[PDB]
Amino acid sequence: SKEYHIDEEVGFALPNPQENLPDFYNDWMFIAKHLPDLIESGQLRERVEKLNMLSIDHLTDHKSQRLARLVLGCITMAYVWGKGHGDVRKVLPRNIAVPYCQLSKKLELPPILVYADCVLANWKKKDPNKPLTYENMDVLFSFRDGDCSKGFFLVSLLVEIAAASAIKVIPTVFKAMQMQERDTLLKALLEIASCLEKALQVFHQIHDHVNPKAFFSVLRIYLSGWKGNPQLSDGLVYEGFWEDPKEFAGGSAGQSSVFQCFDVLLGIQQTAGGGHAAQFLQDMRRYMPPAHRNFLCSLESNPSVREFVLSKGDAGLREAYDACVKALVSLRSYHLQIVTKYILIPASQQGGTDLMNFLKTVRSTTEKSLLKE
Amino acid sequence: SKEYHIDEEVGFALPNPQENLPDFYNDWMFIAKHLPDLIESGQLRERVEKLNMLSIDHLTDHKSQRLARLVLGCITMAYVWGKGHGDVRKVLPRNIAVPYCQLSKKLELPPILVYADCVLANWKKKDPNKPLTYENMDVLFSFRDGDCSKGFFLVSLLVEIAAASAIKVIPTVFKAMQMQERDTLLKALLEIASCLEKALQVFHQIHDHVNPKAFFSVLRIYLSGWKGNPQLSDGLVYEGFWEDPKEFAGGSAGQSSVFQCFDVLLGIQQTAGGGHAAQFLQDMRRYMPPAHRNFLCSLESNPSVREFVLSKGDAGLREAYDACVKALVSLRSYHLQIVTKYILIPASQQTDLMNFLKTVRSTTEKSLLKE
Ligand code: HEM
Numbered sequence: 128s129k130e131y132h133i134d135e136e137v138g139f140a141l142p143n144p145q146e147n148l149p150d151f152y153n154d155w156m157f158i159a160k161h162l163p164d165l166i167e168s169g170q171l172r173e174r175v176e177k178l179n180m181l182s183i184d185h186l187t188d189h190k191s192q193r194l195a196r197l198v199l200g201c202i203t204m205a206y207v208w209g210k211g212h213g214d215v216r217k218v219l220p221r222n223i224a225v226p227y228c229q230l231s232k233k234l235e236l237p238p239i240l241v242y243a244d245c246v247l248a249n250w251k252k253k254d255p256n257k258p259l260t261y262e263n264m265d266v267l268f269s270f271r272d273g274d275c276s277k278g279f280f281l282v283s284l285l286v287e288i289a290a291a292s293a294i295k296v297i298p299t300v301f302k303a304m305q306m307q308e309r310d311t312l313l314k315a316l317l318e319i320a321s322c323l324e325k326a327l328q329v330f331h332q333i334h335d336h337v338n339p340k341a342f343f344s345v346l347r348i349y350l351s352g353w354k355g356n357p358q359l360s361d362g363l364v365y366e367g368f369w370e371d372p373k374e375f376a377g378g379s380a381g382q383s384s385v386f387q388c389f390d391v392l393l394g395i396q397q398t399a400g401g402g403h404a405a406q407f408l409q410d411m412r413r414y415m416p417p418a419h420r421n422f423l424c425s426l427e428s429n430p431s432v433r434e435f436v437l438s439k440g441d442a443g444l445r446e447a448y449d450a451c452v453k454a455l456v457s458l459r460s461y462h463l464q465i466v467t468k469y470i471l472i473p474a475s476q477q478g479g480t481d482l483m484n485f486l487k488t489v490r491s492t493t494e495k496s497l498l499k500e
Numbered sequence: 501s502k503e504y505h506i507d508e509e510v511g512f513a514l515p516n517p518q519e520n521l522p523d524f525y526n527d528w529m530f531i532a533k534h535l536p537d538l539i540e541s542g543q544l545r546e547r548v549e550k551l552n553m554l555s556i557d558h559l560t561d562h563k564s565q566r567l568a569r570l571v572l573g574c575i576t577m578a579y580v581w582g583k584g585h586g587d588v589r590k591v592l593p594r595n596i597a598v599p600y601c602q603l604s605k606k607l608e609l610p611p612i613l614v615y616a617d618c619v620l621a622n623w624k625k626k627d628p629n630k631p632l633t634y635e636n637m638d639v640l641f642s643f644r645d646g647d648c649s650k651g652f653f654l655v656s657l658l659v660e661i662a663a664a665s666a667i668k669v670i671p672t673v674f675k676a677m678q679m680q681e682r683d684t685l686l687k688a689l690l691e692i693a694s695c696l697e698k699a700l701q702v703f704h705q706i707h708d709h710v711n712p713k714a715f716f717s718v719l720r721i722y723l724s725g726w727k728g729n730p731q732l733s734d735g736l737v738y739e740g741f742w743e744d745p746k747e748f749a750g751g752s753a754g755q756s757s758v759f760q761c762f763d764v765l766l767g768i769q770q771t772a773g774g775g776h777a778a779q780f781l782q783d784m785r786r787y788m789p790p791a792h793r794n795f796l797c798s799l800e801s802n803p804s805v806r807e808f809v810l811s812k813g814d815a816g817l818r819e820a821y822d823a824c825v826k827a828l829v830s831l832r833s834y835h836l837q838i839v840t841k842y843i844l845i846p847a848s849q850q851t852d853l854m855n856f857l858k859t860v861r862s863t864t865e866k867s868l869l870k871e
């Protein structure tokens with residue numbers, strides 16, 4: 128590939144993000160490094176106003192700028208939702224709203240916490256000379272004590288690094304098609320399916336590191352946005368930056384590029400149709416880094432691997448392509464059982480069928496693309 | 501400029517489209533070649549219904565499939581809207597709804613008549629040796645006798661080809677910004693500014709071939725879709741392909757790819773934000789051919805030309821960039837004049853859209869180098 132900011136070892140996630148802003152921004156990071164104690168003791172929402180407007184011009188590196196996107200990303204999320212019980216804040220102060228919105232429009236991201244922030248730029252190696260395992264990694268910023276966000280964010284990242292190992296052979300696939308090298312194409316497609324089968328194994332780790340009570344009842348509120356959300360009926364007001372309140376969608380893993388990249392590579396029409404699911408995934412691309420957004424657009428400009436394999440009438444090539452489509456149906460059927468345990472069941476203990484049909488539609492169209500036609 | 505299916509003469513349009521399908525589709529072609537006659541005689545719907553279901557497996561090349569799309573697209577709009585007097589059909593019969601939908605998914609386009617059907621693939625040179633001018637061209641299919649569909653389509657197409665001549669220099673803009681070649685970058689922008697300038701002069705031909713009442717009362721209804729239409733509140737049933745009635749937008753020049761690419765090129769954030777205008781132009785992109793959608797998002801992959809120009813302190817450079825933007829404000833201001841003549845005052849003869857054209861006009865005029 129060219130420079131869509133892809134790391135051969137890590138992929139779309141940010142490789143080794145820096146852990147601390149420059150000492151100018153010390154007073155920012157203070158609220159960011161201490162949100163658990165800060166909102167439990169009720170000291171959070173006013174310490175925001177105690178801040179004065181820092182300028183973004185001394186964040187020199189991309190790693191520096193994106194780390195600041197994370198600290199301001201969570202600082203706003205903790206401000207708007209607060210305790211997490213219903214006390215809502217419908218307007219951000221301006222000494223925090225316009226630093227965020229400026230660096231957001233410089234990085235071309237919406238001024239909200241996106242998946243690229245709280246996962247891809249939100250980790251560190253405990254001991255730098257170890258493998259990237261959950262035992263050796265740690266999240267840089269959490270919202271509340273017992274959030275399980277360490278397990279939730281990193282297990283999310285861990286299977287992203289797992290499937291990103293398949294990105295490296297995507298050029299091999301398109302090479303083998305155009306130069307009509309049948310065998311290497313079949314071994315490239317099998318290696319694609321290997322990673323997605325292993326990303327399902329890494330997905331198993333979420334049971335050990337997140338419990339359903341915490342996720343649904345503390346972590347889910349802090350990651351929800353103010354688009355189509357009654358608590359901020361028509362969005363959040365940005366003092367000094369925008370006249371009116373603007374609506375933005377909360378974090379989703381639909382903003383990850385690998386979890387849309389395999390759907391376009393395999394000719395799976397996730398974004399086709401005027402459907403709710405297609406519109407959701409198409410819109411979530413706006414919440415991806417501009418380099419990653421340009422990477423999906425770049426994949427869509429290639430010939431369909433699905434049409435190539437079906438034309439050749441090769442039982443070998445078709446079985447390998449189905450393996451990838453199967454490995455995706457697996458990752459989404461298993462996700463369905465996890466949404467069952469971590470959202471469905473904790474909701475019946477305090478309408479939501481729309482949540483399950485979306486994920487079933489995205490799997491339904493994935494299952495249709497199998498070479499059973 | 502790799503194969504985004506942009507010819508250097510006709511641009512986004514289809515270079516020399518096909519007008520005859522194979523003999524296996526005569527029953528389709530007959531209905532399409534006689535849409536006015538079949539509608540005036542009340543015979544159209546009976547002919548569409550008695551159709552046998554035909555396989556799309558004989559449409560081999562891209563052009564044959566584009567003709568059948570425009571063939572089946574027009575027959576569909578004819579069947580749904582009828583004589584145009586409110587007696588609609590909200591169930592498209594199986595024997596036409598299935599081949600239409602199979603073909604549409606094969607070409608990755610909504611199963612409704614789209615701009616790249618009735619315009620970019622709906623033309624024909626009278627004489628193969630003479631240039632592309634209105635008097636040398638003709639449409640392939642029309643709705644009613646006197647609907648001025650020849651004028652409306654061919655003028656829109658000729659305006660597109662005019663602006664399409666600017667597509668060829670877009671590679672030199674981004675390579676000049678790259679190598680920092682100032683003078684060639686200035687000549688490139690002014691060449692864009694001239695092609696946009698000429699397209700406005702081609703636009704003037706609209707008054708000579710489109711009668712205002714025939715458009716508003718006749719042609720505007722055979723181009724309307726079933727998305728937010730009270731006459732088909734929940735869409736149209738594609739009997740035999742989907743259980744449910746689907747909603748789809750009618751033809752609109754928002755589906756034209758020339759007239760969204762220049763806003764992207766010049767850093768005009770027409771699709772930015774979440775407003776209704778930005779989403780309508782974003783929602784209208786799913787109606788472009790797949791190779792044309794790819795061209796737009798790949799332009800977005802490039803650095804912003806506007807911020808580059810704003811950094812140079814080069815008055816000659818800015819005057820050239822502004823020349824492009826002002827030519828877009830001219831085209832949109834003259835459009836607003838046109839919509840008043842061809843829609844507004846015919847409606848008075850027994851604002852939601854006007855605020856849309858003024859919103860996008862203001863967004864363009866905001867990109868003028870004043871900040
Ligand atoms: C307890 C854990 C999880 C819960 C409760 C959960 C819940 C959900 C929900 C509710 C959605 C619906 C979209 C929305 O409403 O925003 C969703 C979408 C999605 N989730 Fe998860 N999720 C979890 C873990 C994961 C992980 C670890 C991944 C991958 C790293 C993942 C990948 C996706 C993807 C790709 C979508 C978009 C729909 C699709 O492409 O199929 N999720 N998730």
Ligand code: HEM
Binds near residue numbers: 660703752839842
């Ligand atoms: C009698 C002739 C015309 C009428 C009545 C007309 C009417 C309209 C209307 C109502 C819209 C808004 C979208 C909608 O409500 O569906 C629109 C948008 C548009 N029309 Fe036209 N139009 C005409 C001719 C043309 C021609 C010849 C072009 C050739 C370029 C053109 C280009 C556009 C474009 C690009 C838009 C999208 C908004 C924008 O990009 O600024 N139209 N037109």
Ligand SMILES: Oc1ccc(Cl)cc1-c1cn[nH]n1
Binds near residue numbers: 377379380
């Ligand atoms: O895994 C995640 C990590 C961070 C954020 Cl903001 C969202 C997700 C997610 C998973 N499924 N839907 N959203």
Ligand SMILES: Oc1ccc(Cl)cc1-c1cn[nH]n1
Binds near residue numbers: 290323326385389462
């Ligand atoms: O849609 C996906 C594409 C790739 C990968 Cl690795 C995972 C998913 C997924 C997982 N859970 N729901 N969707």
Ligand SMILES: Oc1ccc(Cl)cc1-c1cn[nH]n1
Binds near residue numbers: 750751753754
């Ligand atoms: O110019 C056109 C040609 C064909 C079709 Cl379907 C629509 C338009 C149009 C222009 N402005 N609104 N719609």
